Amino acid sequence: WVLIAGYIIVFVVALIGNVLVCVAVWKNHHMRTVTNYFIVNLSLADVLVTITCLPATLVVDITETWFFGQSLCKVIPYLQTVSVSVSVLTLSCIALDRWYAICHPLMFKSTAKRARNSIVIIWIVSCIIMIPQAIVMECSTVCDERWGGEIYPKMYHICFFLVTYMAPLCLMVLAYLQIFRKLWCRQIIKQIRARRKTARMLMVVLLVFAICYLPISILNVLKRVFGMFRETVYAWFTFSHWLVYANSAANPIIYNFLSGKFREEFKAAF
Amino acid sequence: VQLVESGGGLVQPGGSRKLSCSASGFAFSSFGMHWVRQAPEKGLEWVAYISSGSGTIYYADTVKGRFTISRDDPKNTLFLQMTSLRSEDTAMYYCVRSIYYYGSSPFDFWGQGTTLTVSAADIVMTQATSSVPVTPGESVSISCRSSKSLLHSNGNTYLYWFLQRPGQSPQLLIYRMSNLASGVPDRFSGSGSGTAFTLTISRLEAEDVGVYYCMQHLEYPLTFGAGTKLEL
Amino acid sequence: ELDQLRQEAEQLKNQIRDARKACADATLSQITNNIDPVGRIQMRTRRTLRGHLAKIYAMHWGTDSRLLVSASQDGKLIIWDSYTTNKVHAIPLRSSWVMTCAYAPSGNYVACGGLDNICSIYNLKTREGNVRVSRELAGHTGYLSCCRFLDDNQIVTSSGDTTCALWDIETGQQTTTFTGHTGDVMSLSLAPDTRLFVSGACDASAKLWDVREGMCRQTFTGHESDINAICFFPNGNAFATGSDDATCRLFDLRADQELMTYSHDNIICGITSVSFSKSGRLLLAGYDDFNCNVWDALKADRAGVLAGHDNRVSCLGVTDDGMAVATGSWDSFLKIWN
Amino acid sequence: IAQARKLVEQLKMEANIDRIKVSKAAADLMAYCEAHAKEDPLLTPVPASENPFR
Amino acid sequence: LSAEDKAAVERSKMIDRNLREDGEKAAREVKLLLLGAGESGKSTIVKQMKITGIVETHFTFKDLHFKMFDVGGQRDERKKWIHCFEGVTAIIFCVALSDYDLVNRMHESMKLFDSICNNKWFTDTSIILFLNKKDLFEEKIKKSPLTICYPEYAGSNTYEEAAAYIQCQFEDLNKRKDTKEIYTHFTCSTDTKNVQFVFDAVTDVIIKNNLKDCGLF
Ligand SMILES: COC(=O)N1CCC[C@H](NS(C)(=O)=O)[C@@H]1CO[C@H]1CC[C@@H](c2ccccc2)CC1
């Protein structure tokens, strides 16, 4: 029965964290840094996903019955999945930006123009690279996917898995592995402690993202690509969605409230 | 500052030609440039305009599309490629400098011109008189009656007065109806009000005889006046 | 003798002090109590001119009160058209370290100094398009803190070598060097008739010179620290000096003594600029608490606060016609208030 | 040395200066503020019609 | 509406683009402030690194544009113009290490270092200090012990121990620790190594700044 309580607490925590981050980065004149553009875009996508998908997944997996109209089911899944995709792509872009700002600092490829360009490109590619989820939706009593074949959905969902988990996770792993290598070797007591704190921060980010988006990725790439799938299915989907929303709630805290600079700025900004 | 123009020949009607304006002395990159033609007997007439950096280009309604105007700052040149030359383009073309900033002096410098013979919604601005008898020393006045009031909402009343001495390139006398281009004697004065303007010359000298052209700059095309020729 | 000369100077200074004290029957506060206060005056940010990409350390309104030149440390000084926010010129600087700015009364020239110790005078109304350096006045042993234009031909500069100079621009050589200060001359201000100016230095004193012959006509003390800025009461017979001890005073030339002081307990931060309204009633003051407090230069009671800047306000200027006040701060944004 | 002579001379010429009572200077400042009070846009907010900034 | 003010706005936008490009290409240049202590071989290191008021020794190294600001030739209240140098990527320093017996001179140098390493303006800019005249310092210490310049010294009067002591004392003056690590070098090798040290220390400073802004320390 604790699933509902977990969902509600995750909902409230995600909203409060996202709104706090948005106000802090928009009502403060010292938070216009280039990386803060990526952070605020991440928080925007995070609030959007936690407000759109969460109630929909909760109602569709607890009642096993769609509670909206045909057009509503045609539109809401697209917003759901594009929000998740843009969130993950923003995490990947943050990792790449950190790689540039740490591993390759002397070429200074961390300009605000580049941040805006990256935000725009990820937004449009997320809206485009996976547009079929908007049209292929069909309504029955739960509305689901309707395909004119098996190979086409197989290819589409394997590509979706590549773009949502495999590619972002590989990019993040490479970026943070090289960043940690540089911070561990390129130094020629307090410095060692700071380096290990940074390693802890990077490991926290990387492992949280990798673990949180793993169950859903595997479930989608085995249910659709391999055609699997139901007692355990409902529980697994509920738990997976809950941990995705836990990741969504943690992103504000994981990226902003765990950094001394942002913590001090927020404390002095309120 | 100097503008030297070339590319004038006996073009067969309906043909094509290119006109080059080479600029020396001034920072040609920052200066917008106009091309302004003049028929052998008629008065001036606007042709084309390029802003600084080629951000904006305008053409007169009678040469729209036919004439393409471009510029190259690194070579410091202004090109006008003109095609399908009807008999109405047998005009000498001037290359006019112009810089647009608060308190600037647009149209200040005019090129030397290139004789160019071709084988066989606007704001009309009238000149009350075209020829007057002028004594060397008696003050005179010239009237320019516009159609649409040129007193813009922000105080500026865009109306320029140019002087063209015989066998020379016209030079800017007054801009915005009450000013003086650098190097112009104070004898010239501008006055009036929106839709009716006056240029007064006090203690006229023998170096002022010529044709005085009235222009507006409120909106393109910049229809010139008919010219009020003075005589001795 | 050195000792007898020193004690004679000390007793002469004591005579100065007692004579000026005896000529003070009622302070300005008592006389100005009767007149009603200016109340609270709220002036919004009509314009926010945002072109600089670094700190801005000085500006100066044009005579027409429409063009303002503002100099930043990014190597540029920009001539803003305050009415429409347009920039009419973006003059680069030979040395990006600029700590002053001036816009000639006729509007033809501008001047900027800085750490280079050279006051570069640029010509704007040139028949070439680009702004050309008319002159590079040199001869100061230290940085230039404030340079003001007397005419299109004479410019008075204040440097960190404890001296002021009156450069004749045409010949580009000092025509009169004002000595007498014992510290960096941090700020300068001309009279409405430009017949005599004042200079405020780091020795905690403001000196009234007279450009005609170049001698300190008067010396004013009272400040406990530096004097970061000065301006005149438009009357031309009283001047108000900022300071680094969070206090701007009001001296008068005729009575040759301090009249009153504008200190409020919850301010502990040094001034950076001071200016008057065209009527001289309300006194602007650019505090480096990121805002400028509009005082009332008859009763000392603060009349408002133009708190709209993210960083320290380093330059301030009230238009010649009094229609607006422009404040420029180290955040690279200078705002017009009205 | 010579600088001391210059300092004493400048102090001397500063001492021999006409000095008016603070009452007169304060009254003059008050009168100047009053006479030009109506012509200070900052002090008296002029109507937005006659305000070049808007 | 905007009869020819359109052209004025176009000019404004053009010069705004120029300003933005200038700012972008100036942000990719590391600005260093060279203080020194006066007669501390500042000219020597300036010439080696190159390969009136203040002289800007703009130069380049490995596609990195260094702008070195030498304010030594300016005698006035330092605190009044020092705040102009916020954001300088590094604050080079020079110490006439051979000037331990000169007069005390190194004591004035220490006072200057303490003053400039604890200014409220430079609470984050790292200091890259060179102890010039290493060879001359070795000869001088061989001639006379180091106790003359430091009565508290207790150690071998050799190059290694004395250099270590001076380096430790100069790293001990920065009260605002844990926020500005200072890199100490011995600029006496007459080879293209001092500029290399400046480069590989400025890269470290940039990395530290980036990971501070990125939220990693
Ligand atoms: C079975 O789940 C799905 O694959 N969904 C996607 C289509 C809408 C569906 N919404 S629903 C069941 O109809 O309420 C559902 C829920 O998607 C939201 C948004 C996208 C997220 C994601 C999914 C795969 C890979 C990476 C991220 C998961 C949460």
mmCIF file of N, CA and C in Angstrom, chain A residues 54-122:
data_model
loop_
_atom_site.group_PDB
_atom_site.id
_atom_site.type_symbol
_atom_site.label_atom_id
_atom_site.label_comp_id
_atom_site.label_asym_id
_atom_site.label_seq_id
_atom_site.Cartn_x
_atom_site.Cartn_y
_atom_site.Cartn_z
ATOM 1 N N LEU A 54 3.486 11.450 -14.402
ATOM 2 C CA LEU A 54 3.261 10.781 -13.120
ATOM 3 C C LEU A 54 1.794 10.451 -12.887
ATOM 4 N N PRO A 55 0.867 11.413 -12.905
ATOM 5 C CA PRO A 55 -0.545 11.044 -12.716
ATOM 6 C C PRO A 55 -1.042 10.073 -13.769
ATOM 7 N N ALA A 56 -0.608 10.246 -15.018
ATOM 8 C CA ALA A 56 -1.072 9.374 -16.090
ATOM 9 C C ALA A 56 -0.622 7.939 -15.860
ATOM 10 N N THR A 57 0.664 7.741 -15.563
ATOM 11 C CA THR A 57 1.141 6.388 -15.303
ATOM 12 C C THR A 57 0.470 5.807 -14.067
ATOM 13 N N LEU A 58 0.276 6.627 -13.033
ATOM 14 C CA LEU A 58 -0.351 6.128 -11.815
ATOM 15 C C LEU A 58 -1.755 5.615 -12.102
ATOM 16 N N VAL A 59 -2.561 6.411 -12.804
ATOM 17 C CA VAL A 59 -3.935 6.001 -13.075
ATOM 18 C C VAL A 59 -3.966 4.816 -14.033
ATOM 19 N N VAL A 60 -3.057 4.780 -15.010
ATOM 20 C CA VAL A 60 -3.121 3.718 -16.008
ATOM 21 C C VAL A 60 -2.571 2.394 -15.491
ATOM 22 N N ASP A 61 -1.726 2.403 -14.455
ATOM 23 C CA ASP A 61 -1.194 1.153 -13.925
ATOM 24 C C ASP A 61 -1.875 0.702 -12.640
ATOM 25 N N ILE A 62 -2.530 1.602 -11.909
ATOM 26 C CA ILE A 62 -3.242 1.192 -10.702
ATOM 27 C C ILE A 62 -4.672 0.772 -11.016
ATOM 28 N N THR A 63 -5.343 1.476 -11.928
ATOM 29 C CA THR A 63 -6.702 1.131 -12.319
ATOM 30 C C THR A 63 -6.762 0.298 -13.592
ATOM 31 N N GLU A 64 -5.640 0.134 -14.295
ATOM 32 C CA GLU A 64 -5.601 -0.649 -15.530
ATOM 33 C C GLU A 64 -6.678 -0.191 -16.510
ATOM 34 N N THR A 65 -7.060 1.082 -16.431
ATOM 35 C CA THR A 65 -8.136 1.609 -17.260
ATOM 36 C C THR A 65 -7.841 3.060 -17.599
ATOM 37 N N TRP A 66 -7.844 3.372 -18.892
ATOM 38 C CA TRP A 66 -7.653 4.746 -19.330
ATOM 39 C C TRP A 66 -8.804 5.619 -18.843
ATOM 40 N N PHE A 67 -8.475 6.842 -18.421
ATOM 41 C CA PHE A 67 -9.449 7.758 -17.836
ATOM 42 C C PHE A 67 -9.576 9.054 -18.632
ATOM 43 N N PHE A 68 -9.184 9.053 -19.905
ATOM 44 C CA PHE A 68 -9.226 10.254 -20.728
ATOM 45 C C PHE A 68 -9.757 9.894 -22.110
ATOM 46 N N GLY A 69 -9.851 10.909 -22.974
ATOM 47 C CA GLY A 69 -10.424 10.744 -24.292
ATOM 48 C C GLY A 69 -9.409 10.296 -25.330
ATOM 49 N N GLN A 70 -9.896 10.173 -26.567
ATOM 50 C CA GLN A 70 -9.049 9.699 -27.656
ATOM 51 C C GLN A 70 -7.931 10.693 -27.947
ATOM 52 N N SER A 71 -8.277 11.971 -28.115
ATOM 53 C CA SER A 71 -7.256 12.978 -28.384
ATOM 54 C C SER A 71 -6.310 13.126 -27.201
ATOM 55 N N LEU A 72 -6.838 13.009 -25.981
ATOM 56 C CA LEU A 72 -5.981 13.108 -24.807
ATOM 57 C C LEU A 72 -4.944 11.993 -24.792
ATOM 58 N N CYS A 73 -5.347 10.765 -25.128
ATOM 59 C CA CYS A 73 -4.372 9.685 -25.218
ATOM 60 C C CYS A 73 -3.480 9.815 -26.442
ATOM 61 N N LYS A 74 -3.920 10.534 -27.471
ATOM 62 C CA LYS A 74 -3.062 10.749 -28.627
ATOM 63 C C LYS A 74 -1.983 11.784 -28.341
ATOM 64 N N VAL A 75 -2.251 12.721 -27.438
ATOM 65 C CA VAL A 75 -1.330 13.822 -27.162
ATOM 66 C C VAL A 75 -0.456 13.542 -25.943
ATOM 67 N N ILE A 76 -1.048 13.072 -24.840
ATOM 68 C CA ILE A 76 -0.303 12.997 -23.581
ATOM 69 C C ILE A 76 0.912 12.089 -23.681
ATOM 70 N N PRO A 77 0.866 10.921 -24.332
ATOM 71 C CA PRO A 77 2.083 10.096 -24.386
ATOM 72 C C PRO A 77 3.230 10.787 -25.092
ATOM 73 N N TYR A 78 2.941 11.586 -26.121
ATOM 74 C CA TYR A 78 4.003 12.307 -26.808
ATOM 75 C C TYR A 78 4.684 13.292 -25.871
ATOM 76 N N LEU A 79 3.897 14.078 -25.132
ATOM 77 C CA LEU A 79 4.486 14.991 -24.155
ATOM 78 C C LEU A 79 5.276 14.221 -23.107
ATOM 79 N N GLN A 80 4.701 13.130 -22.604
ATOM 80 C CA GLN A 80 5.374 12.272 -21.638
ATOM 81 C C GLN A 80 6.776 11.913 -22.114
ATOM 82 N N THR A 81 6.832 11.246 -23.264
ATOM 83 C CA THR A 81 8.074 10.653 -23.730
ATOM 84 C C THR A 81 9.053 11.711 -24.219
ATOM 85 N N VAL A 82 8.564 12.793 -24.830
ATOM 86 C CA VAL A 82 9.474 13.858 -25.236
ATOM 87 C C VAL A 82 10.066 14.539 -24.013
ATOM 88 N N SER A 83 9.281 14.685 -22.942
ATOM 89 C CA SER A 83 9.812 15.266 -21.715
ATOM 90 C C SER A 83 10.912 14.388 -21.134
ATOM 91 N N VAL A 84 10.665 13.081 -21.054
ATOM 92 C CA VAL A 84 11.699 12.189 -20.533
ATOM 93 C C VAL A 84 12.941 12.241 -21.417
ATOM 94 N N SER A 85 12.747 12.223 -22.737
ATOM 95 C CA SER A 85 13.880 12.218 -23.654
ATOM 96 C C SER A 85 14.690 13.501 -23.540
ATOM 97 N N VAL A 86 14.023 14.653 -23.450
ATOM 98 C CA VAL A 86 14.751 15.910 -23.333
ATOM 99 C C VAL A 86 15.465 15.985 -21.993
ATOM 100 N N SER A 87 14.858 15.447 -20.933
ATOM 101 C CA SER A 87 15.556 15.387 -19.653
ATOM 102 C C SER A 87 16.857 14.603 -19.780
ATOM 103 N N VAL A 88 16.782 13.391 -20.332
ATOM 104 C CA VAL A 88 17.980 12.561 -20.427
ATOM 105 C C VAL A 88 19.009 13.207 -21.348
ATOM 106 N N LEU A 89 18.557 13.784 -22.462
ATOM 107 C CA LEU A 89 19.479 14.459 -23.363
ATOM 108 C C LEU A 89 20.128 15.661 -22.695
ATOM 109 N N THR A 90 19.409 16.342 -21.802
ATOM 110 C CA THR A 90 20.007 17.460 -21.085
ATOM 111 C C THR A 90 21.050 16.974 -20.092
ATOM 112 N N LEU A 91 20.811 15.829 -19.449
ATOM 113 C CA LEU A 91 21.866 15.243 -18.625
ATOM 114 C C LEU A 91 23.096 14.915 -19.465
ATOM 115 N N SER A 92 22.887 14.342 -20.651
ATOM 116 C CA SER A 92 24.018 14.025 -21.519
ATOM 117 C C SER A 92 24.764 15.286 -21.940
ATOM 118 N N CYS A 93 24.031 16.344 -22.283
ATOM 119 C CA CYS A 93 24.673 17.593 -22.674
ATOM 120 C C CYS A 93 25.416 18.219 -21.503
ATOM 121 N N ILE A 94 24.879 18.091 -20.290
ATOM 122 C CA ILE A 94 25.597 18.568 -19.113
ATOM 123 C C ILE A 94 26.906 17.811 -18.959
ATOM 124 N N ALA A 95 26.872 16.493 -19.155
ATOM 125 C CA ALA A 95 28.101 15.712 -19.058
ATOM 126 C C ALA A 95 29.114 16.152 -20.105
ATOM 127 N N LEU A 96 28.662 16.377 -21.338
ATOM 128 C CA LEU A 96 29.581 16.819 -22.387
ATOM 129 C C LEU A 96 30.149 18.200 -22.078
ATOM 130 N N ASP A 97 29.309 19.106 -21.577
ATOM 131 C CA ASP A 97 29.780 20.435 -21.210
ATOM 132 C C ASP A 97 30.822 20.360 -20.107
ATOM 133 N N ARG A 98 30.592 19.511 -19.106
ATOM 134 C CA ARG A 98 31.583 19.342 -18.050
ATOM 135 C C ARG A 98 32.874 18.767 -18.609
ATOM 136 N N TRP A 99 32.772 17.822 -19.542
ATOM 137 C CA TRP A 99 33.974 17.276 -20.160
ATOM 138 C C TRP A 99 34.774 18.373 -20.847
ATOM 139 N N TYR A 100 34.097 19.224 -21.620
ATOM 140 C CA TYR A 100 34.792 20.337 -22.263
ATOM 141 C C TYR A 100 35.398 21.282 -21.233
ATOM 142 N N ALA A 101 34.652 21.599 -20.176
ATOM 143 C CA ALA A 101 35.117 22.588 -19.214
ATOM 144 C C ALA A 101 36.214 22.052 -18.306
ATOM 145 N N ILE A 102 36.415 20.737 -18.260
ATOM 146 C CA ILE A 102 37.424 20.119 -17.404
ATOM 147 C C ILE A 102 38.526 19.466 -18.232
ATOM 148 N N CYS A 103 38.161 18.543 -19.124
ATOM 149 C CA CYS A 103 39.179 17.811 -19.871
ATOM 150 C C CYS A 103 39.843 18.690 -20.922
ATOM 151 N N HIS A 104 39.090 19.605 -21.528
ATOM 152 C CA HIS A 104 39.592 20.474 -22.592
ATOM 153 C C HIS A 104 39.251 21.919 -22.263
ATOM 154 N N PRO A 105 39.928 22.503 -21.269
ATOM 155 C CA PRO A 105 39.564 23.857 -20.833
ATOM 156 C C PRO A 105 40.104 24.961 -21.717
ATOM 157 N N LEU A 106 41.183 24.717 -22.459
ATOM 158 C CA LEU A 106 41.885 25.787 -23.156
ATOM 159 C C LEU A 106 41.250 26.166 -24.487
ATOM 160 N N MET A 107 40.335 25.358 -25.018
ATOM 161 C CA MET A 107 39.586 25.751 -26.204
ATOM 162 C C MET A 107 38.280 26.461 -25.869
ATOM 163 N N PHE A 108 37.909 26.528 -24.591
ATOM 164 C CA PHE A 108 36.826 27.395 -24.128
ATOM 165 C C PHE A 108 35.540 27.170 -24.920
ATOM 166 N N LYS A 109 35.198 25.906 -25.152
ATOM 167 C CA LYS A 109 33.959 25.571 -25.856
ATOM 168 C C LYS A 109 32.814 25.390 -24.856
ATOM 169 N N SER A 110 32.592 26.436 -24.064
ATOM 170 C CA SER A 110 31.517 26.462 -23.078
ATOM 171 C C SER A 110 30.827 27.817 -23.089
ATOM 172 N N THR A 111 30.568 28.349 -24.280
ATOM 173 C CA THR A 111 29.939 29.653 -24.409
ATOM 174 C C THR A 111 28.425 29.540 -24.275
ATOM 175 N N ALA A 112 27.806 30.623 -23.797
ATOM 176 C CA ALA A 112 26.355 30.634 -23.645
ATOM 177 C C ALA A 112 25.653 30.392 -24.974
ATOM 178 N N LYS A 113 26.239 30.866 -26.077
ATOM 179 C CA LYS A 113 25.671 30.578 -27.388
ATOM 180 C C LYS A 113 25.629 29.077 -27.634
ATOM 181 N N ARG A 114 26.703 28.372 -27.276
ATOM 182 C CA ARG A 114 26.713 26.923 -27.434
ATOM 183 C C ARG A 114 25.665 26.269 -26.546
ATOM 184 N N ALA A 115 25.467 26.794 -25.337
ATOM 185 C CA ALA A 115 24.442 26.242 -24.457
ATOM 186 C C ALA A 115 23.056 26.392 -25.072
ATOM 187 N N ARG A 116 22.755 27.578 -25.605
ATOM 188 C CA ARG A 116 21.459 27.784 -26.243
ATOM 189 C C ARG A 116 21.295 26.874 -27.453
ATOM 190 N N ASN A 117 22.344 26.746 -28.267
ATOM 191 C CA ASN A 117 22.267 25.877 -29.435
ATOM 192 C C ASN A 117 22.025 24.431 -29.026
ATOM 193 N N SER A 118 22.721 23.965 -27.989
ATOM 194 C CA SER A 118 22.533 22.596 -27.527
ATOM 195 C C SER A 118 21.122 22.386 -26.999
ATOM 196 N N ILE A 119 20.599 23.350 -26.242
ATOM 197 C CA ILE A 119 19.240 23.219 -25.724
ATOM 198 C C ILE A 119 18.248 23.125 -26.876
ATOM 199 N N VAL A 120 18.402 23.997 -27.874
ATOM 200 C CA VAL A 120 17.475 23.995 -29.001
ATOM 201 C C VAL A 120 17.564 22.680 -29.765
ATOM 202 N N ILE A 121 18.783 22.203 -30.026
ATOM 203 C CA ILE A 121 18.930 20.991 -30.824
ATOM 204 C C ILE A 121 18.367 19.787 -30.078
ATOM 205 N N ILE A 122 18.626 19.681 -28.771
ATOM 206 C CA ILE A 122 18.070 18.553 -28.029
ATOM 207 C C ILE A 122 16.550 18.634 -28.005
#
